[PDB]
């Protein structure tokens, strides 16, 4: 029935028209399939997913950046990415990826001064969320410390 309706119009029977090229202006071999397809635009647009953050706001209880897009936030450098950087020999990239860029507040203000002055260098320090872990374990009957 599709063939008989393509025969009513003067279209080719097999549905395939030979098509020229726009750049070269010379014919594509082995004639190609054209027609009309009914295509839908979905509302997963690209200027609703795209996001970027240099330095925004920081969370209150653990001094790490906020999450999401409406809150101007940074992407979660999750656990499997930490495994994938342990799997290379990248050691300084992971150290700044979880001490300087993320958590340590004096470390990141030293970093921001050092970046706007041209000196690429990090003063590491300690994650502040590890001090939160010390306060939560210490708030039990447990006595966690840091020796030496």
């Amino acid at each position: 029935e599709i063939k008989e309706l393509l025969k009513l119009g003067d279209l080719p029977t097999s549905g395939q028209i030979r098509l020229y090229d726009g750049r070269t202006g010379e014919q594509f071999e082995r004639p190609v399939t054209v027609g009309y397809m009914y295509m839908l635009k979905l509302n997963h647009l690209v200027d609703d997913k795209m996001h970027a953050r240099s330095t925004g706001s920081y969370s209150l209880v653990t001094q790490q950046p906020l999450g999401g897009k409406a809150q101007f936030g940074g992407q979660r450098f999750g656990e499997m990415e930490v495994w994938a950087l342990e799997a290379y020999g990248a050691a300084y990239t992971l150290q700044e990826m979880l001490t300087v860029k993320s958590d340590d507040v004096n470390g990141r203000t030293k970093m921001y001064k050092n970046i706007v002055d041209g000196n690429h260098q990090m003063e590491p320090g300690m994650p502040e969320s590890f001090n939160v872990l010390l306060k939560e374990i210490r708030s039990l009957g447990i006595n966690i410390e840091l020796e030496d």
Binding site: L19, F28, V32, T33, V34, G35, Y36, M37, Y38, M39, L40, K41, N43
Partner: protein
């Protein structure tokens, strides 16, 4: 959605895995130009001072 003239051919890699390659004739005709509306609220609260 809308019905458009489609061809099945590999065209210079720009439709490699599942991608779609669209002429400017589609965007000139203003035919996928969807219209969105955002609601922005602003309340006048009651605080101190």
């Amino acid at each position: 959605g809308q019905n458009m003239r489609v061809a099945f051919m590999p065209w210079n890699g720009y439709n490699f895995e599942d991608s779609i390659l669209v002429s400017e004739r589609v965007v000139q005709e203003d035919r996928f130009t969807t219209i969105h509306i955002q609601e922005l609220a602003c309340v006048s609260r009651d605080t101190k001072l």
